Nucleic acid binder design. Sequence first.
DNA 1: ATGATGACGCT
DNA 2: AGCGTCAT
Length: 430
Amino acid sequence: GPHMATGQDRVVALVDMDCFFVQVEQRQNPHLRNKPCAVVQYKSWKGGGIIAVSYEARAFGVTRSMWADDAKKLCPDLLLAQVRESRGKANLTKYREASVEVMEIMSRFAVIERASIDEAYVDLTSAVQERLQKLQGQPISADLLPSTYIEGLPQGPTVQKEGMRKQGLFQWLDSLQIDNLTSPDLQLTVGAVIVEEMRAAIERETGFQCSAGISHNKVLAKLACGLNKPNRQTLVSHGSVPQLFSQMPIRKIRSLGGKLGASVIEILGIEYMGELTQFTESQLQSHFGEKNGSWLYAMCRGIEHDPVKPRQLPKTIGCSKNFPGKTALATREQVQWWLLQLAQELEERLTKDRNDNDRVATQLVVSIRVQGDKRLSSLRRCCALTRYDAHKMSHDAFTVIKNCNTSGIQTEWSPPLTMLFLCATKFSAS
DNA sequence: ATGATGACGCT
DNA sequence: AGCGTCAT
Ligand SMILES: Nc1nc2c(ncn2[C@H]2C[C@H](O)[C@@H](COP(=O)(O)NP(=O)(O)OP(=O)(O)O)O2)c(=O)[nH]1
Ligand SMILES: [Mg+2]
Ligand SMILES: [Mg+2]
């Protein structure tokens, strides 16, 4: 009772851009705005692979990983923007630049953890404390939370979405105990006020809309964010967790979407996150290991301790290209030319990184995939990254992988390569 | 024939 | 050091 931690010590938010690459293209080309629209990579094979989809197009069944030709069958008037192609590969520079726009704005409110090209966590615990003491003790008006959902409300004793949102928010605010600065529900609420302000600033200064989750930890914040996309934010209180998790498939929890989540389901014979509470910590540790067991024991109770890391920049800079089926690289000269293309993009991004961020990469990781191998990587080799020079980087990459070539002859490569991947790592201050 | 490519755990 | 997992 008095000694059992409830995991309510922090206020954490996750902000994620709505259909991000689509919004980047819609900002640039007004003709695409408020329309079913998707962003695709390449064009020749089946119209291009879709990697982002406007909410208007999602209503037709268009999804990520769909070929554009197939999406067009679902949505004949679907509009398409293609990712820039440079040196024969996809070039995502425009979206990396848009990302920096958003991250730099979020950084004004608190130190962020950049978690992807379009989302960041923020620890608002301190900001919340300062806002609480400076609002004197005033109650929090619903007007300060104009796009906020309270997960689980309304409950108990309007048939349209906005009406439901407000009734839930009203129930929540009417119940708040604003006289107690230590109340976690209050801290979350103030967090939500701050996130409304953050999201307003993002939209005002970039034109991009986003959604957000506010909770006590990263996993719940991320989950909350998704509950009411697009252009809304969701507060998941500690109190909301039992009902929320009681019907929540285990795979919806980040890190559980793969084989670990599958084994939890199979070994324990359960479906929902809440069902995990039945097991002792030792029981979970026995099935899934010490780290996973402890994590699962706490997580099914809404508790997680992973900190928001002070990290606004990516830890690695990399680029890759697949060469599927018949396009697999089967000659020495081919392998070298594409290593050079990848290396040239990497040099330009590295040089820009050094100027912007006062750091230099010191290690180069070369990854390949061979024909027949379904793994992401068949083989990885590293070498020193001592100069931002594409010819040197590509030559060095060839050197460390050249012995994979089981060909007898000079100019051929066997088995043919279905992927090349250069990744610059181990940054140092410069 | 998804693709591009990013974080991070394990040994 | 190099491989596996999860992600989208
Ligand atoms: N090259 C590449 N880019 C991708 C891929 N998957 C996603 N992206 C790019 C494209 C995405 O726009 C962007 C952000 O990914 P999300 O936040 O997971 N999806 P979004 O923001 O589109 O929609 P919403 O968040 O509203 O559900 O990352 C991929 O497989 N490959
Ligand atoms: Mg997004
Ligand atoms: Mg995202």
